[PDB]
Short mmCIF file of C-alpha atoms in Angstrom, two decimals:
data_model
loop_
_atom_site.label_atom_id
_atom_site.label_comp_id
_atom_site.label_asym_id
_atom_site.label_seq_id
_atom_site.Cartn_x
_atom_site.Cartn_y
_atom_site.Cartn_z
CA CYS A 1 -5.49 -63.99 12.36
CA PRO A 2 -3.28 -60.89 12.80
CA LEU A 3 -2.21 -61.18 9.13
CA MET A 4 -4.48 -62.20 6.23
CA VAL A 5 -3.77 -62.47 2.48
CA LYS A 6 -6.43 -62.49 -0.28
CA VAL A 7 -5.72 -63.17 -3.98
CA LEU A 8 -8.04 -62.47 -6.96
CA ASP A 9 -7.99 -63.30 -10.72
CA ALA A 10 -8.88 -60.40 -13.08
CA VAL A 11 -9.18 -62.55 -16.24
CA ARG A 12 -11.81 -65.06 -15.08
CA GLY A 13 -13.43 -62.98 -12.30
CA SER A 14 -12.80 -65.48 -9.51
CA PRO A 15 -10.66 -66.07 -6.40
CA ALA A 16 -7.20 -67.40 -7.34
CA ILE A 17 -7.07 -71.03 -6.14
CA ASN A 18 -4.01 -73.18 -5.25
CA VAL A 19 -1.54 -70.26 -5.24
CA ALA A 20 1.61 -70.42 -3.07
CA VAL A 21 2.13 -67.55 -0.59
CA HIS A 22 5.41 -67.04 1.35
CA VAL A 23 6.01 -64.45 4.13
CA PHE A 24 9.47 -63.28 5.36
CA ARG A 25 10.63 -60.97 8.20
CA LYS A 26 13.75 -58.76 8.18
CA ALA A 27 16.36 -59.68 10.80
CA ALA A 28 18.77 -57.30 12.60
CA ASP A 29 21.46 -58.81 10.34
CA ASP A 30 19.47 -57.20 7.47
CA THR A 31 18.55 -60.52 5.78
CA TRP A 32 15.21 -62.13 4.82
CA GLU A 33 13.97 -64.85 7.15
CA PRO A 34 11.03 -67.27 6.55
CA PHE A 35 8.06 -66.45 8.84
CA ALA A 36 4.87 -68.06 7.43
CA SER A 37 3.53 -69.75 4.28
CA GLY A 38 0.52 -71.52 2.74
CA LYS A 39 -1.51 -72.27 -0.37
CA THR A 40 -4.70 -70.36 -1.29
CA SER A 41 -8.05 -72.07 -0.66
CA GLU A 42 -11.22 -71.85 -2.78
CA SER A 43 -11.79 -68.43 -1.17
CA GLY A 44 -8.43 -67.15 -2.48
CA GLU A 45 -7.01 -67.09 1.06
CA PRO A 46 -4.33 -69.21 2.78
CA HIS A 47 -5.86 -69.98 6.17
CA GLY A 48 -4.10 -69.45 9.50
CA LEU A 49 -0.85 -67.79 8.44
CA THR A 50 0.34 -66.72 11.93
CA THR A 51 -0.58 -65.98 15.59
CA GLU A 52 -0.69 -62.86 17.79
CA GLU A 53 2.41 -63.84 19.85
CA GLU A 54 4.54 -64.34 16.73
CA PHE A 55 3.53 -61.26 14.67
CA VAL A 56 5.63 -58.51 16.30
CA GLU A 57 6.58 -55.03 14.97
CA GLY A 58 9.11 -55.10 12.11
CA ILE A 59 9.64 -55.12 8.33
CA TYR A 60 7.79 -57.90 6.44
CA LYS A 61 7.70 -59.27 2.87
CA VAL A 62 4.76 -61.13 1.26
CA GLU A 63 5.60 -63.16 -1.89
CA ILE A 64 2.88 -64.60 -4.17
CA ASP A 65 3.86 -67.21 -6.83
CA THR A 66 1.93 -65.78 -9.77
CA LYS A 67 3.99 -67.40 -12.58
CA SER A 68 3.02 -70.98 -11.62
CA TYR A 69 -0.65 -69.98 -11.48
CA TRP A 70 -0.84 -68.55 -15.05
CA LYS A 71 1.31 -71.35 -16.58
CA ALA A 72 -1.19 -73.93 -15.26
CA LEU A 73 -4.11 -72.16 -17.00
CA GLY A 74 -2.23 -72.07 -20.32
CA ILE A 75 -1.85 -68.27 -20.24
CA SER A 76 1.57 -66.60 -20.73
CA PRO A 77 2.56 -64.36 -17.73
CA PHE A 78 5.00 -61.41 -17.38
CA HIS A 79 6.06 -61.36 -13.70
CA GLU A 80 8.11 -63.98 -11.85
CA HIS A 81 5.93 -63.25 -8.81
CA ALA A 82 4.27 -60.44 -6.81
CA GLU A 83 5.91 -58.98 -3.68
CA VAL A 84 4.64 -56.60 -0.99
CA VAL A 85 7.09 -55.11 1.57
CA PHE A 86 5.86 -53.08 4.58
CA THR A 87 6.54 -51.88 8.15
CA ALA A 88 4.19 -53.43 10.68
CA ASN A 89 2.68 -52.47 14.01
CA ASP A 90 4.57 -49.14 14.50
CA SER A 91 1.91 -48.16 17.04
CA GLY A 92 1.10 -51.77 17.99
CA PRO A 93 -0.45 -54.45 15.74
CA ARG A 94 -4.15 -54.45 14.81
CA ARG A 95 -5.53 -56.67 12.06
CA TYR A 96 -3.74 -56.51 8.71
CA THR A 97 -5.28 -57.59 5.39
CA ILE A 98 -3.12 -57.67 2.25
CA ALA A 99 -5.11 -57.93 -1.01
CA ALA A 100 -3.66 -58.72 -4.47
CA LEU A 101 -5.40 -58.44 -7.86
CA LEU A 102 -3.79 -60.41 -10.73
CA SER A 103 -3.60 -60.08 -14.54
CA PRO A 104 -1.02 -61.67 -16.94
CA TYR A 105 0.87 -58.36 -17.43
CA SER A 106 -0.27 -56.44 -14.30
CA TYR A 107 -0.98 -56.57 -10.55
CA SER A 108 -2.27 -54.22 -7.84
CA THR A 109 -2.00 -54.42 -4.04
CA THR A 110 -3.73 -52.74 -1.09
CA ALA A 111 -3.50 -52.94 2.71
CA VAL A 112 -6.48 -52.67 5.05
CA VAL A 113 -5.82 -52.07 8.76
CA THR A 114 -8.92 -52.46 10.98
CA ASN A 115 -9.45 -52.17 14.74
CA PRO A 116 -9.69 -55.81 16.01
CA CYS B 1 16.03 -46.81 -24.33
CA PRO B 2 15.04 -50.50 -23.94
CA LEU B 3 13.90 -50.05 -20.31
CA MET B 4 11.55 -47.18 -19.36
CA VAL B 5 9.73 -46.34 -16.10
CA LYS B 6 6.82 -43.96 -15.34
CA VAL B 7 5.50 -43.05 -11.84
CA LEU B 8 2.22 -41.27 -10.86
CA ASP B 9 0.86 -39.72 -7.60
CA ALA B 10 -2.81 -40.63 -6.92
CA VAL B 11 -3.13 -38.15 -4.02
CA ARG B 12 -2.01 -34.92 -5.71
CA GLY B 13 -2.97 -35.82 -9.30
CA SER B 14 0.51 -35.31 -10.72
CA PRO B 15 3.63 -37.17 -11.83
CA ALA B 16 5.77 -38.37 -8.91
CA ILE B 17 8.76 -36.02 -9.17
CA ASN B 18 12.25 -36.67 -7.71
CA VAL B 19 11.70 -40.36 -6.80
CA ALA B 20 14.65 -42.78 -6.83
CA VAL B 21 14.46 -45.89 -9.08
CA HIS B 22 16.92 -48.80 -8.58
CA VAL B 23 17.50 -51.75 -11.00
CA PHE B 24 19.13 -55.12 -10.11
CA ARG B 25 19.99 -58.28 -12.13
CA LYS B 26 20.02 -61.83 -10.68
CA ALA B 27 23.50 -63.41 -10.44
CA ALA B 28 24.53 -67.09 -10.74
CA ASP B 29 24.80 -67.30 -6.93
CA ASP B 30 21.12 -66.23 -6.69
CA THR B 31 21.99 -62.78 -5.30
CA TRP B 32 20.81 -59.43 -6.71
CA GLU B 33 23.60 -57.46 -8.44
CA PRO B 34 23.27 -53.66 -9.04
CA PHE B 35 22.54 -52.95 -12.74
CA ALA B 36 21.28 -49.32 -13.05
CA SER B 37 19.63 -46.39 -11.16
CA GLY B 38 18.13 -42.89 -11.70
CA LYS B 39 15.67 -40.28 -10.39
CA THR B 40 12.31 -39.20 -11.86
CA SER B 41 12.07 -35.88 -13.73
CA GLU B 42 9.09 -33.46 -13.77
CA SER B 43 7.40 -35.97 -16.12
CA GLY B 44 7.72 -38.86 -13.61
CA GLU B 45 10.31 -40.69 -15.74
CA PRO B 46 14.02 -41.38 -15.24
CA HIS B 47 15.70 -40.82 -18.62
CA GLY B 48 18.45 -43.11 -19.94
CA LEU B 49 18.46 -45.89 -17.33
CA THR B 50 20.36 -48.28 -19.67
CA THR B 51 21.36 -49.17 -23.27
CA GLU B 52 20.77 -51.90 -25.88
CA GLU B 53 24.38 -53.15 -25.51
CA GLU B 54 24.11 -53.50 -21.72
CA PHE B 55 20.55 -54.92 -21.42
CA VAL B 56 21.11 -58.69 -21.99
CA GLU B 57 18.97 -61.78 -21.14
CA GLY B 58 18.26 -62.30 -17.43
CA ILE B 59 15.88 -61.89 -14.49
CA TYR B 60 15.54 -58.22 -13.44
CA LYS B 61 14.16 -56.34 -10.39
CA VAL B 62 12.93 -52.73 -10.49
CA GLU B 63 12.60 -50.97 -7.11
CA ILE B 64 10.84 -47.61 -6.53
CA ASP B 65 11.62 -45.66 -3.30
CA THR B 66 8.02 -44.80 -2.31
CA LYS B 67 8.87 -44.34 1.39
CA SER B 68 11.13 -41.28 0.94
CA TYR B 69 8.53 -39.75 -1.41
CA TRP B 70 5.57 -39.76 1.02
CA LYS B 71 7.82 -38.51 3.85
CA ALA B 72 9.10 -35.41 2.03
CA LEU B 73 5.41 -34.59 1.47
CA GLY B 74 4.55 -35.01 5.17
CA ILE B 75 2.36 -38.10 4.65
CA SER B 76 2.62 -41.50 6.40
CA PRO B 77 3.48 -44.37 3.99
CA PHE B 78 2.69 -48.07 4.47
CA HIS B 79 5.10 -49.69 1.97
CA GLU B 80 8.91 -49.60 2.11
CA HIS B 81 9.03 -49.58 -1.70
CA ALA B 82 7.27 -50.87 -4.85
CA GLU B 83 8.87 -53.82 -6.69
CA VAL B 84 8.63 -55.51 -10.12
CA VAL B 85 10.43 -58.80 -10.98
CA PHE B 86 10.55 -60.28 -14.54
CA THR B 87 12.53 -62.35 -17.11
CA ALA B 88 13.74 -60.16 -20.02
CA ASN B 89 14.83 -60.84 -23.64
CA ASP B 90 14.28 -64.64 -23.51
CA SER B 91 13.00 -64.84 -27.13
CA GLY B 92 15.23 -62.01 -28.41
CA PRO B 93 15.56 -58.25 -27.68
CA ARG B 94 12.41 -56.29 -26.70
CA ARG B 95 11.58 -52.83 -25.29
CA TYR B 96 9.94 -52.59 -21.85
CA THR B 97 7.85 -49.89 -20.18
CA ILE B 98 6.98 -50.24 -16.48
CA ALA B 99 4.14 -48.03 -15.18
CA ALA B 100 3.45 -47.51 -11.45
CA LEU B 101 0.58 -45.75 -9.66
CA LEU B 102 1.13 -44.70 -6.01
CA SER B 103 -1.14 -44.17 -2.96
CA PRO B 104 -0.10 -44.19 0.75
CA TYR B 105 -1.56 -47.70 1.38
CA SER B 106 -1.66 -49.14 -2.19
CA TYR B 107 0.10 -49.41 -5.57
CA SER B 108 -0.42 -50.90 -9.03
CA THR B 109 2.02 -51.86 -11.78
CA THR B 110 1.75 -52.75 -15.47
CA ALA B 111 4.14 -53.70 -18.30
CA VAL B 112 4.11 -52.80 -22.01
CA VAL B 113 6.40 -54.93 -24.21
CA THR B 114 7.13 -54.03 -27.86
CA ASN B 115 9.39 -55.65 -30.47
CA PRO B 116 12.28 -53.27 -31.37
CA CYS C 1 -4.49 -30.59 -26.35
CA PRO C 2 -6.16 -29.80 -22.98
CA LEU C 3 -7.79 -33.26 -22.72
CA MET C 4 -5.71 -36.42 -23.29
CA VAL C 5 -6.52 -40.14 -22.83
CA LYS C 6 -4.27 -43.25 -22.66
CA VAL C 7 -5.48 -46.90 -22.60
CA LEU C 8 -3.50 -50.10 -21.74
CA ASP C 9 -4.19 -53.88 -22.12
CA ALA C 10 -3.20 -55.90 -19.01
CA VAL C 11 -3.70 -59.27 -20.76
CA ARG C 12 -1.46 -58.83 -23.81
CA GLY C 13 1.00 -56.30 -22.32
CA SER C 14 0.41 -53.66 -24.98
CA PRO C 15 -1.44 -50.41 -25.67
CA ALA C 16 -5.15 -50.93 -26.37
CA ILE C 17 -5.31 -50.20 -30.10
CA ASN C 18 -8.45 -49.17 -32.06
CA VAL C 19 -10.70 -48.53 -29.01
CA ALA C 20 -13.49 -45.93 -29.21
CA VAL C 21 -13.49 -43.03 -26.69
CA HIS C 22 -16.63 -40.86 -26.24
CA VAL C 23 -16.83 -37.50 -24.34
CA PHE C 24 -20.04 -35.86 -23.00
CA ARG C 25 -20.78 -32.56 -21.16
CA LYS C 26 -23.63 -32.08 -18.64
CA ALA C 27 -26.43 -29.75 -19.84
CA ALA C 28 -28.69 -27.41 -17.81
CA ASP C 29 -31.51 -29.99 -18.02
CA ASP C 30 -29.19 -32.54 -16.33
CA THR C 31 -28.79 -34.60 -19.52
CA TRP C 32 -25.47 -35.62 -21.13
CA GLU C 33 -24.73 -33.75 -24.38
CA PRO C 34 -22.16 -35.11 -26.93
CA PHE C 35 -18.92 -33.07 -26.78
CA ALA C 36 -16.16 -35.07 -28.59
CA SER C 37 -15.04 -38.58 -29.72
CA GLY C 38 -12.07 -40.47 -31.25
CA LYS C 39 -10.31 -43.85 -31.58
CA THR C 40 -7.00 -44.99 -30.02
CA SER C 41 -3.88 -45.17 -32.22
CA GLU C 42 -1.04 -47.73 -31.99
CA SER C 43 0.12 -45.81 -28.89
CA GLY C 44 -3.25 -46.25 -27.10
CA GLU C 45 -4.12 -42.53 -27.40
CA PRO C 46 -6.75 -40.67 -29.42
CA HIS C 47 -5.05 -37.54 -30.81
CA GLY C 48 -6.78 -34.15 -30.91
CA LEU C 49 -10.00 -34.86 -29.00
CA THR C 50 -10.67 -31.13 -28.41
CA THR C 51 -9.21 -27.57 -28.26
CA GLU C 52 -8.57 -24.77 -25.73
CA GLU C 53 -11.36 -22.63 -27.26
CA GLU C 54 -13.96 -25.41 -27.01
CA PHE C 55 -13.04 -26.87 -23.56
CA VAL C 56 -14.92 -24.54 -21.15
CA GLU C 57 -15.99 -24.95 -17.47
CA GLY C 58 -18.40 -27.83 -16.78
CA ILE C 59 -18.93 -31.41 -15.62
CA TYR C 60 -17.55 -33.94 -18.14
CA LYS C 61 -17.91 -37.71 -18.73
CA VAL C 62 -15.31 -39.85 -20.56
CA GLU C 63 -16.50 -43.26 -21.80
CA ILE C 64 -14.23 -46.06 -23.11
CA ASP C 65 -15.79 -48.87 -25.22
CA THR C 66 -14.14 -51.84 -23.47
CA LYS C 67 -16.84 -54.32 -24.56
CA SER C 68 -16.11 -54.13 -28.32
CA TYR C 69 -12.38 -54.41 -27.58
CA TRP C 70 -12.48 -57.74 -25.69
CA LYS C 71 -14.91 -59.19 -28.26
CA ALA C 72 -12.73 -58.52 -31.32
CA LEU C 73 -10.00 -60.39 -29.40
CA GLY C 74 -12.27 -63.38 -28.69
CA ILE C 75 -12.39 -62.81 -24.91
CA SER C 76 -15.49 -62.50 -22.67
CA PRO C 77 -15.81 -59.03 -21.02
CA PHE C 78 -17.65 -58.20 -17.79
CA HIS C 79 -18.07 -54.41 -18.11
CA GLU C 80 -20.09 -52.57 -20.75
CA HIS C 81 -17.57 -49.71 -20.66
CA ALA C 82 -15.20 -47.75 -18.37
CA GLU C 83 -16.33 -44.28 -17.19
CA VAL C 84 -14.77 -41.16 -15.63
CA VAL C 85 -16.85 -38.17 -14.38
CA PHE C 86 -15.28 -34.85 -13.20
CA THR C 87 -15.66 -31.03 -12.89
CA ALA C 88 -13.18 -29.20 -15.18
CA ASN C 89 -11.65 -25.68 -15.24
CA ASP C 90 -13.44 -24.42 -12.08
CA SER C 91 -10.43 -22.34 -10.90
CA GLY C 92 -9.25 -21.46 -14.42
CA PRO C 93 -7.96 -23.44 -17.45
CA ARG C 94 -5.95 -26.64 -16.81
CA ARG C 95 -4.67 -29.61 -18.86
CA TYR C 96 -6.01 -33.10 -18.09
CA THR C 97 -4.64 -36.59 -18.75
CA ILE C 98 -6.87 -39.62 -18.08
CA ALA C 99 -5.11 -43.01 -17.86
CA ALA C 100 -7.00 -46.33 -17.96
CA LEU C 101 -5.79 -49.91 -17.39
CA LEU C 102 -8.00 -52.76 -18.72
CA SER C 103 -8.60 -56.42 -17.72
CA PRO C 104 -11.66 -58.59 -18.58
CA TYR C 105 -13.15 -58.31 -15.04
CA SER C 106 -11.44 -55.12 -13.74
CA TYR C 107 -10.21 -51.59 -14.57
CA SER C 108 -8.39 -48.67 -12.95
CA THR C 109 -8.30 -44.96 -13.77
CA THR C 110 -6.13 -42.00 -12.75
CA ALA C 111 -5.96 -38.27 -13.53
CA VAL C 112 -2.97 -35.94 -14.00
CA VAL C 113 -3.79 -32.20 -13.88
CA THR C 114 -1.24 -29.52 -14.85
CA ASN C 115 -1.49 -25.73 -15.06
CA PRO C 116 -1.16 -24.58 -18.72
CA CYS D 1 -27.03 -61.42 -0.93
CA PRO D 2 -26.85 -61.93 -4.72
CA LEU D 3 -25.08 -58.54 -5.05
CA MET D 4 -22.47 -57.15 -2.63
CA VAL D 5 -20.45 -53.91 -2.73
CA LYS D 6 -17.22 -53.26 -0.79
CA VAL D 7 -15.44 -49.86 -0.59
CA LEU D 8 -11.85 -49.19 0.60
CA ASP D 9 -9.78 -46.04 1.36
CA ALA D 10 -6.20 -46.02 -0.06
CA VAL D 11 -5.04 -42.92 1.88
CA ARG D 12 -5.76 -44.06 5.44
CA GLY D 13 -5.71 -47.85 4.87
CA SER D 14 -9.22 -48.50 6.15
CA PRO D 15 -12.74 -49.42 5.00
CA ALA D 16 -14.60 -46.35 3.68
CA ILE D 17 -17.38 -45.60 6.21
CA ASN D 18 -20.69 -43.73 5.68
CA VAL D 19 -20.47 -43.70 1.86
CA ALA D 20 -23.66 -43.58 -0.25
CA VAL D 21 -24.11 -46.38 -2.83
CA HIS D 22 -26.85 -46.32 -5.51
CA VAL D 23 -27.70 -49.16 -7.96
CA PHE D 24 -29.71 -48.77 -11.21
CA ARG D 25 -31.03 -51.25 -13.84
CA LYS D 26 -31.50 -50.55 -17.57
CA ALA D 27 -35.10 -50.72 -18.78
CA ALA D 28 -36.33 -51.82 -22.24
CA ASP D 29 -37.00 -48.10 -22.84
CA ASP D 30 -33.17 -47.72 -22.54
CA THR D 31 -33.30 -45.53 -19.40
CA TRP D 32 -31.75 -45.87 -15.91
CA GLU D 33 -34.09 -47.06 -13.18
CA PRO D 34 -33.43 -47.11 -9.39
CA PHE D 35 -32.99 -50.69 -8.09
CA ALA D 36 -31.21 -50.63 -4.70
CA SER D 37 -29.27 -48.28 -2.39
CA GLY D 38 -27.59 -47.96 1.02
CA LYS D 39 -24.82 -46.41 3.09
CA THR D 40 -21.54 -48.21 3.88
CA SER D 41 -21.11 -49.69 7.37
CA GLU D 42 -17.92 -49.88 9.46
CA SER D 43 -16.92 -52.84 7.24
CA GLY D 44 -17.11 -50.67 4.10
CA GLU D 45 -20.22 -52.56 2.92
CA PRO D 46 -23.89 -51.52 2.59
CA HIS D 47 -25.77 -54.48 4.03
CA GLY D 48 -28.66 -56.24 2.29
CA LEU D 49 -28.78 -54.48 -1.08
CA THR D 50 -31.19 -56.89 -2.84
CA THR D 51 -32.80 -60.37 -2.93
CA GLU D 52 -32.60 -63.40 -5.25
CA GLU D 53 -36.11 -62.88 -6.73
CA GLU D 54 -35.38 -59.25 -7.66
CA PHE D 55 -31.86 -59.59 -9.13
CA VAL D 56 -32.62 -60.88 -12.66
CA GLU D 57 -30.39 -60.91 -15.80
CA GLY D 58 -29.82 -57.45 -17.32
CA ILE D 59 -27.55 -54.38 -17.48
CA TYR D 60 -26.77 -52.76 -14.09
CA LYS D 61 -25.02 -49.58 -12.85
CA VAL D 62 -23.37 -49.13 -9.42
CA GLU D 63 -22.75 -45.50 -8.34
CA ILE D 64 -20.54 -44.62 -5.34
CA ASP D 65 -20.61 -41.03 -3.95
CA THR D 66 -16.88 -40.49 -3.55
CA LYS D 67 -16.90 -36.65 -3.62
CA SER D 68 -18.92 -36.31 -0.38
CA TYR D 69 -16.57 -38.77 1.35
CA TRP D 70 -13.32 -36.85 0.60
CA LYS D 71 -14.86 -33.40 1.29
CA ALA D 72 -15.80 -34.56 4.81
CA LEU D 73 -12.18 -35.57 5.56
CA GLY D 74 -10.87 -32.18 4.39
CA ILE D 75 -9.14 -33.68 1.32
CA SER D 76 -9.72 -32.25 -2.19
CA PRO D 77 -11.10 -34.92 -4.65
CA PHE D 78 -11.06 -35.17 -8.49
CA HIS D 79 -14.07 -37.34 -9.41
CA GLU D 80 -17.75 -36.50 -8.96
CA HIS D 81 -18.29 -40.20 -8.17
CA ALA D 82 -17.31 -43.74 -9.21
CA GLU D 83 -19.52 -45.82 -11.54
CA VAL D 84 -19.43 -49.49 -12.57
CA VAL D 85 -21.66 -50.74 -15.44
CA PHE D 86 -21.99 -54.47 -16.24
CA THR D 87 -24.13 -57.26 -17.77
CA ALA D 88 -25.42 -59.69 -15.16
CA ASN D 89 -26.38 -63.34 -15.01
CA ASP D 90 -25.96 -64.15 -18.75
CA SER D 91 -25.77 -67.82 -17.80
CA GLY D 92 -27.88 -67.40 -14.64
CA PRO D 93 -26.96 -65.39 -11.51
CA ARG D 94 -24.39 -66.64 -8.97
CA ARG D 95 -22.98 -64.38 -6.27
CA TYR D 96 -21.56 -61.04 -7.44
CA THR D 97 -19.09 -58.94 -5.45
CA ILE D 98 -18.13 -55.47 -6.69
CA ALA D 99 -15.03 -53.99 -5.00
CA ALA D 100 -13.86 -50.35 -5.24
CA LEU D 101 -10.52 -48.89 -4.11
CA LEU D 102 -10.44 -45.08 -3.60
CA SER D 103 -7.80 -42.32 -3.79
CA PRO D 104 -8.35 -38.52 -4.24
CA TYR D 105 -7.27 -38.60 -7.94
CA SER D 106 -7.80 -42.33 -8.74
CA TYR D 107 -10.03 -45.40 -8.34
CA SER D 108 -9.96 -49.08 -9.32
CA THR D 109 -12.77 -51.65 -9.54
CA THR D 110 -12.99 -55.45 -9.75
CA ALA D 111 -15.78 -58.05 -9.94
CA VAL D 112 -15.66 -61.44 -8.23
CA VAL D 113 -18.19 -64.08 -9.30
CA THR D 114 -18.28 -67.16 -7.03
CA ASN D 115 -20.40 -70.34 -7.06
CA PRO D 116 -23.03 -69.83 -4.29
#
């Protein structure tokens, strides 16, 4: 998978399960355009987001529905969601991993690019 | 000041100086309308973004121009910008502080909410 | 105040109030000698930890009692405490601010260093 | 492996390679006692830290030599190292993963406990 997403829960010390993840790509018209989506597994990952042919250079946005996750646990959240926006593949694609760490009033995100 | 923002540089060990901060409010057509903007001082804070009279109920988006910051410094950034999206003042007026910590391939964000 | 500390709660969206902060300095026998201690105020900061006369060159350790904090709140903590170890004043006197963000299973820490 | 460590670099967006990791366990005498150690691979992990028979309930400390890593890249660091101290296995062991994200003047750590 050229693009992987991994979501973790900082309150219970576990992978975040059943979380919706949506990915968008910027078009030449300058608008956001659906590209890929899924729901996190027991590993905290939505499996098989995209393919190598489809993931070209460009500007991408990863949206994680954090509000629905916390509401289900009976814990009051701050954010509507968590978004990560980045430029891809500027010197070709490799393998991209986007990680997100979640708390009710905070989140952190990191990108790991590794040689395939 | 009911909305405050503070930005830090994890590479140089200093406040992130001269960074643009943009604020938008969600409209009834589901578009983002400009609400307020400013630039960080030597302390990493933009002073006087808004007022108590202007800051009503709604869904808000805070956007930090991380890309122009790393470029002026001669460092390659991954993210286009760092975002924060939240519902404000739903159970009455409150004061909000948004903290952001910046690295070339990662960021974190937290919120502190106090009753005025 | 050449050494400052600030602590935040990522679960409640507030400063971490009434948390103990302990400071140690490395001795010539390679043991940690007590140097200073305090408790966080309503702002999440312990005021007046040390002075310019007392804060000489050396290797320092800052320890935050996260375990007693989560327990008073009726939440299960993972970490015993949050630590920060650094060499201070090697190229002359400086001022240091240590920021810490706390969740039950995670923490982050950053340093801001300014010339006095 | 009952205990795994994973180290990431926030400046270059890669796994942190060739980093020394030391693990200690608290003894009844209240002193720190070597338990396991290794060097990070190309994945940012030191492989095969311990075994199931050896990793019993107790208080543990994970030390990551961050200063030697940054010095080798020609980038000036703040911390001497990064330490994580925690109570293990209180209701039996499971599988423990300790993650660490590194910048010159900052680090963050998280623990993920999953059912084996």
